[PDB]
Ligand binder design. Sequence first.
Ligand code: HEM
Ligand SMILES: N#Cc1ccc(NC(=O)NCc2cnc3scc(C#CC4CC4)n23)cc1
Length: 370
Amino acid sequence: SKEYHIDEEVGFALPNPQENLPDFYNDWMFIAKHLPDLIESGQLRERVEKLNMLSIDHLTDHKSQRLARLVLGCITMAYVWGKGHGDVRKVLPRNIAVPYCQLSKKLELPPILVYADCVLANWKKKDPNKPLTYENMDVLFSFRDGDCSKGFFLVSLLVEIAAASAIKVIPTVFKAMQMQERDTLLKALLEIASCLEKALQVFHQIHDHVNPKAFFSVLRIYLSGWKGNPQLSDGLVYEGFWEDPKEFAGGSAGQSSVFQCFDVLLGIQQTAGGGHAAQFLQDMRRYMPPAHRNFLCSLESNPSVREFVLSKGDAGLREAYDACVKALVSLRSYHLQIVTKYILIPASQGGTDLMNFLKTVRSTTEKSLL
Ligand code: HEM
Ligand SMILES: N#Cc1ccc(NC(=O)NCc2cnc3scc(C#CC4CC4)n23)cc1
């Protein structure tokens, strides 16, 4: 894979993200690094309004442009949502809104915190020479002490890395169909099934690092967006870049490239049929980095793996293909159980529209079995 910014170790995640910005930008990173205390102390909003307008021209390489986008997205969430108790600011000041909207046009991402910010660019190893495990990793930014953003972001990142071993198999799946190598195709499919089955275990780690009350009452408050949100019904005003208020969706793992890429690989048409779920997954492609959007489009341009396997009357191929579909179904069923524990039950102590979305996506997956 060429310039799709896919890493063979960490997949769609940004490999070894930049931790520090140039000194020109320490006014940005002091705030971001101290969001827990600046929010709690009611000082955060005022330091945002205190800030001088910086130019983005001192951010040279790709990693610093991404880190900065992470820094400014977290400051926007903090500023818009404050202490997370419902008192909203509906205008984001220009000394932050202009350089944030400038950088996002530069990266073809919307000016809100997305999955590629706080999951794919929001990590480090503790010791660079020890492996990629929860114990040797940390996030770079959080919102409030005890918000479990470390557990939530890291475990998701760990699933993205576990899926990377399946992604590197994709080129051989398509070459084997073209070159008509049935034995190679069968083994490439069983290899993809194994990786996705191993990713189900990584999901299990969520129960040890995220708490249902902290997730529902704090973390998701700060990840919320302003599209269809009654708290900013007309969207957010970006000071001195648009005079109208503009609506952007909160961050979602519907923005993850990795479950979309296996739906496309296996010919599961998650984006067909005109339902709300198909609509949401298409739109969330604009919230992915353009390189990964480009990868998904190129995947769709390749001949259907499902059609090829259906065409050949080969029980061995049919069962290797079904092994991947079942492994996708298993991930989405366990995930649904996670949502029942971390959203449905807390909300009982709204939640039904998102579960019908996830049930629609799971059932679509399930109906691709042969
Ligand atoms: C506390 C744990 C979790 C909760 C409460 C949760 C909740 C949700 C919700 C409400 C949605 C649908 C709306 C939205 O996208 O924002 C969703 C979608 C999604 N989530 Fe999570 N999630 C959790 C953990 C994870 C983990 C660890 C992953 C691994 C990467 C993940 C991957 C996904 C994916 C891929 C989707 C898109 C729908 C699909 O492909 O089936 N989630 N999640
Ligand atoms: N009531 C309620 C209610 C509660 C939560 C949500 N949505 C939500 O948290 N989406 C993000 C998400 C879903 N799954 C996963 S894994 C890693 C991430 C992430 C992230 C940062 C945001 C980019 N995500 C909707 C409604």
